[PDB]
Enzyme design. Structure first.
Site, PDB file in Angstrom:
ATOM      1  N   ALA A  17      38.432   3.215  25.575  1.00 46.38           N
ATOM      2  CA  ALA A  17      37.805   1.970  25.112  1.00 46.38           C
ATOM      3  C   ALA A  17      36.677   2.252  24.132  1.00 46.38           C
ATOM      4  CB  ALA A  17      37.275   1.147  26.304  1.00 46.38           C
ATOM      5  N   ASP A  50      32.484   5.505  37.035  1.00 40.79           N
ATOM      6  CA  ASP A  50      33.798   5.418  36.381  1.00 40.79           C
ATOM      7  C   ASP A  50      34.628   6.675  36.552  1.00 40.79           C
ATOM      8  OD1 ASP A  50      35.822   4.000  34.943  1.00 40.79           O
ATOM      9  OD2 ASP A  50      34.950   4.608  33.042  1.00 40.79           O
TER      10      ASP A  50
END
Ligand SMILES: NC1=N/C(=C2/CCNC(=O)c3[nH]ccc32)C(=O)N1
Length: 333
Positions: free
Chosen positions: A26, A143
């Site tokens: 991303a 994450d």
């Protein structure tokens, strides 16, 4: 656009010559470069999107990496080493040591076949030791996922079993510190990639280091099976899957949560007979039924996974405790 400045032969910072793309996320892309001002060393350069949220994350990542790399200069705890950073046509670029394939990309190139148990044990120990080092320094990663665990060197041998690829050396490093949060900093309402996201995050009960432990439990199941046990893109379906695999949510968590949208009175607002309901019933089953063998080493792994997937984040095993679990006794011989 980034496409204009990330091609083979492009030179960054009058120093780094692009030879290949390593991966994309991303945030942007990671390219392999020759460093002409360090004797031709090949390095990885993360080129970040010129987009507010990703720029901010990159600046935060640089700060975290400066801290971690100064705290552990020998990389004893296996966090990736940042070499420097610079700006290029408006994009933040971060230079790292060059690693091999992510654990995700390895699984993908292996036809989504799982890792052998002896490799899982070595990888799990290193992941726990590395993330525990973050936890010791008042950080949470937030994450963790197979894309953010990279092999130091991803050479393999191949043999028919399916043809399977087997790592020569399964040593890893942990990467991607763009979402990492200090204890005293603002905690984002939402963290983690969906399949690795802890229940306290979903239910907005507050999160800290234990949410990493949950993510690690999910990673170990994926390493063992080659796929996630939470194949969903919906929060309420995700909770329904947890219930089928791990049992009912603790009453106190349901009592406390502001996420009343997920519940009908004190139970998940879930129709077992809808399309999603039928899918969950088919796709999910109690955790231990996913075991591929009842040999005691598999039992040891699943005991650890079950403790990592404890719903209550206070009760949940810590990484310091995980490192002392029987599953790892084989490494200590
Ligand atoms: N997600 C993420 N990946 C990163 C790196 C930078 C670390 N070194 C690498 O070789 C690399 N290969 C593929 C990706 C990477 C990174 O720094 N964040």
């Amino acid at each position: 656009s980034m496409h204009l400045i990330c091609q083979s032969g492009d030179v960054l910072s009058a120093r780094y010559e692009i030879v290949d793309t390593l991966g994309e996320g991303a945030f942007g892309k990671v390219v392999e470069c020759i460093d002409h001002k360090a004797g031709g060393r090949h390095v990885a350069v993360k080129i970040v999107k010129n987009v507010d949220r990703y720029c901010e994350a990159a600046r935060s990542e640089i700060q975290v990496l400066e801290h971690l790399n100064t705290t552990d200069p020998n990389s004893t705890f296996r966090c990736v080493q940042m070499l420097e950073w610079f700006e290029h046509h408006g994009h933040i670029c971060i230079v790292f040591e060059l690693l091999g394939l992510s654990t995700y990309d390895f699984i993908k190139e292996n036809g989504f076949l799982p890792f052998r148990l002896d490799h899982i044990r070595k990888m799990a120990y290193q992941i726990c030791k590395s993330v525990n080092f973050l936890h010791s320094n008042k950080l949470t990663h937030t994450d963790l996922k197979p894309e953010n665990i990279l092999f130091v060197q991803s050479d393999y041998t191949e043999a028919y079993n399916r043809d399977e690829r087997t790592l020569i050396n399964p040593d890893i490093k942990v990467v991607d510190f763009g979402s990492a949060t200090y204890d005293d900093e603002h905690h984002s309402t939402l963290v983690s990639t969906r399949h690795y996201r802890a229940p306290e995050v979903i239910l907005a009960l507050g999160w800290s280091q234990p949410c990493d432990v949950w993510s690690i439990g999910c990673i170990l199941i994926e390493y063992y099976l080659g796929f996630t046990v939470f194949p969903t893109h919906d929060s309420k379906e995700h909770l329904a899957m947890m219930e089928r695999i791990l049992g009912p949510l603790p009453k106190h968590m349901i009592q406390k949560t502001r996420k009343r949208k997920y519940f009908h009175h004190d139970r998940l607002d879930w129709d077992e007979h809808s399309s999603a309901g039928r899918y969950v019933s088919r796709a999910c089953k109690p955790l231990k039924e996913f075991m591929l063998s009842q040999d005691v080493e598999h039992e040891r792994l699943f005991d650890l996974i079950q403790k990592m997937l404890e719903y209550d984040p206070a009760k949940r095993i810590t990484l310091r405790e995980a490192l002392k679990h029987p599953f790892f006794d084989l490494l200590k011989k």
